[PDB]
Design a protein around this nucleic acid. Structure first.
Ligand code: NA
Length: 95
DNA sequence: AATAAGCGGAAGTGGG
DNA sequence: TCCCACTTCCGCTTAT
């Protein structure tokens, strides 16, 4: 099963949910979710995973928080805004 | 208050 | 056994 950070990077590449998530500074890997449309994106994550319950943005963000220590995704000091690591960005484009 | 978001411990579930 | 990679639940805090 795909990892959450990869699901998000792939969405940003495809633009399929551009009203729910977007790059802020793609060269730096900063991205942001829509206040009003993030739940639809969270629902898609849960369905992709086949989880028992309906996924919510809150649960998805709780998972994102666990990447802060290992570094794949860090929370930036703006609402609903995060930053991928250089490792995630480089390996992603190469893959 | 109403609404929204942030913080994050802890217990539960997957798939090795 | 026991970690992976989250998921789910819960109580608390901050927004300015
Ligand atoms: Na605010």
């Amino acid at each position: 099963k795909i990892r959450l950070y990869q699901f998000l990077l792939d969405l940003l590449r495809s633009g399929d949910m551009k009203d729910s998530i977007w790059w802020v500074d793609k060269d730096k890997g900063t991205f942001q979710f829509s206040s009003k449309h993030k739940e639809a994106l969270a629902h898609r994550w849960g369905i992709q995973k086949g989880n028992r319950k309906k996924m919510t943005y809150q649960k998805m963000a709780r998972a994102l928080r666990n990447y802060g220590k290992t570094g794949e995704v860090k929370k930036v000091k703006k609402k609903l805004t995060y930053q991928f690591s250089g490792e995630v960005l480089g390996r992603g484009g190469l893959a």
